[PDB]
């Protein structure tokens, strides 16, 4: 791949057909996962606004990533499941293993568990979907579980929290979050990094570990482990993230790249520079976070793009990054080139201290929000597919777009 910084237009993003409307709807809460030539996908279709429209339909689907015909990858759905009640499924997360995708979701009758954590039951469901369904294949094609046994230690409740995870042999690990009663949280305020921040107070880090400073719970990212060798009803076991560069529990992702897992955590508080790195150990979870000084995301007033000082805030966007060269530590993702607005998605290839090259996906005033990037080989070439929540002013239907971007081998225009 091109390893040089360049302003040449070497990236050539292609809009690919979506996996799968009616006017005045929003396709929201997206998930895309990819592993071994397959993908998993989810969304919520709402009638009305993206945040508060009536929930019409939840989709959970899987399929294949295939050359569409001109050596450009695209997604071909093979197997779709629709939950009976679109109102009660939240925070799905997907892991592939042995010709099935496993999709772990929260079941809630009290709304989004994040926003009504004290009342949430803690109920979880696991859906298994064959990537290649069979004629009259019944339980092979689609199979449901409620997860009865959940080991969560000190945490009051635990939940999947991010689009996708990994398998190691026949053990699945989903990105997840633990809800810990705030009065039980152990934090040394002397560790809050405020030495370069004249207005920051030692308390800021601890107070910002929950969605409000006096929240009942703090949120701690981590993994939910599910060992398929246990049998037909494995337990699920929470595994907390280490406290190095701790930030509020937020949507995260663990993925395999070039022989090792990598973890990404969204920056939903004051630490607004990209949080990702190689996984040193899965259990206990330790992440060798990059000292990346160039990738950030839009926030609001208190914790806008490029903020590094501890503040009490809960805000941001999930815009993940996918390692494409480990030896040289080069990664790709779609970032929003704005300080405080959800606008202007740009596909970006970067190192810790340098953006190498980039491509604007739309216009400067195009609206965009969550982005989920996965990279892989198609006929010997490195490709990335990015799901981008996106729309332009005046559009009567809001729904994500999929962009395929081949990583250039040469740096020449």
């Amino acid at each position: 791949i091109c390893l040089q910084k360049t302003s040449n237009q070497i990236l050539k993003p292609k809009l690919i057909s979506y996996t799968l409307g009616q006017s005045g709807t929003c396709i929201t809460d997206p998930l895309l996962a990819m592993d071994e030539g397959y993908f998993a996908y989810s969304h919520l279709e709402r009638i009305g606004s993206c945040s508060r429209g009536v929930s019409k339909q939840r989709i959970i689907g899987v399929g294949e990533v295939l050359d569409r015909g001109d050596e450009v990858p695209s997604l071909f759905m093979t197997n779709v499941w629709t939950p009976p009640n679109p109102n009660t499924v939240y925070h799905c997360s997907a892991v592939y293993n042995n010709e099935f995708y496993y999709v772990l979701c929260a079941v809630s009758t009290v709304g989004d568990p994040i926003l009504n954590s004290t009342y949430w039951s803690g109920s979880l469901m696991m859906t298994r979907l064959a990537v290649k369904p069979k004629s009259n294949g019944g339980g092979y094609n689609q199979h449901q579980l409620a997860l009865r046994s959940i080991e969560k230690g000190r945490y009051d409740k635990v939940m999947p929290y991010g689009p996708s995870g990994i398998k190691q042999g026949d053990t699945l690990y989903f990105p997840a979050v633990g809800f810990l009663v705030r009065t039980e949280f152990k934090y040394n305020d002397s560790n809050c990094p405020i030495t370069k921040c004249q207005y920051s107070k030692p308390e800021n880090c601890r107070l910002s570990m929950g969605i409000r400073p006096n929240s009942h719970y703090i949120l701690r990212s981590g993994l939910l482990k599910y060992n398929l060798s246990d049998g037909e009803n494995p337990k699920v076991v929470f595994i907390e993230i280490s406290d190095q560069r701790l930030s509020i529990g937020s949507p995260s992702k663990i993925y395999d790249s070039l022989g090792q897992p990598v973890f990404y955590q969204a920056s939903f508080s004051w630490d607004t520079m990209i949080k990702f790195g190689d996984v040193l150990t899965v259990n206990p979870l330790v992440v060798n976070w990059r000292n990346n000084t160039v990738i950030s995301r839009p926030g609001q007033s208190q914790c806008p793009r490029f903020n590094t000082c501890p503040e009490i805030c809960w805000e941001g966007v999930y815009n993940d990054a996918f390692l494409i060269d480990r030896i040289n530590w080069i990664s790709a993702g779609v970032f929003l080139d704005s300080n405080q607005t959800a606008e202007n998605p740009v596909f970006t290839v970067f190192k810790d201290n340098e953006i190498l090259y980039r491509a604007q996906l739309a216009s400067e005033d195009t609206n965009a929000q969550k982005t989920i990037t996965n990279c892989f080989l198609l006929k010997n070439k490195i490709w990335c597919i990015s799901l981008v929540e996106i729309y332009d002013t005046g559009d009567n239907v809001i729904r994500p777009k999929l962009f395929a971007v081949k990583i250039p081998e040469q740096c020449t225009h």
């Binding site: 606004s49 926003l115 207005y199 609001q300 007033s301 607005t341 959800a342 965009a368 729309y391």
Partner: protein, 137 residues
């Protein structure tokens, strides 16, 4: 369109004594609300919130509310930028749609000691409130 920035300070004549500051932003427009750093008079401290109509009418904020501006840094302009659209970095599900009215107030009194006051303040005494009649006119 980028709308004229709104300076959140008690000298601003655009906060009309009866009705506050009324504007008609269109979907796709952008607006900055800025608490200016101290330079003529001393720094004015404010927490500024997006609230519902009743809260605006009554000049009250609730414990559940989170500020959109925390103006407590005398040597730093503090800016909040809004785009009138469905997406944002806001995590509470707050967004903007046509033919709806939105309210921004402060019940702070301008002094450091009154920063966290929950009733009255400049919302009441100076009509430091913004009414955004989105997609109207």
């Amino acid at each position: 369109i980028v709308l004229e920035p709104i300076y959140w300070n008690s000298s601003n004549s655009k906060f009309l004594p009866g009705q506050g500051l009324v504007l008609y932003p269109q979907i796709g427009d952008k607006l900055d609300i800025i608490c200016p750093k101290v330079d003529v008079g001393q720094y004015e401290y404010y927490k500024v919130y997006m609230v519902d109509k009743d809260q605006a009418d009554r000049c009250t904020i609730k414990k559940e509310n989170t500020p959109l501006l925390n103006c407590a840094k005398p040597d730093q302009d503090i800016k909040f930028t809004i785009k009138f659209q469905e997406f944002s970095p806001n995590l509470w599900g707050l967004e903007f749609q046509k033919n709806k009215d939105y309210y921004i107030i402060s019940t702070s009194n301008g002094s450091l000691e009154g920063l966290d006051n929950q009733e009255g303040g400049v919302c009441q005494t100076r009509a430091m409130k913004i009414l955004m009649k989105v997609g109207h006119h």
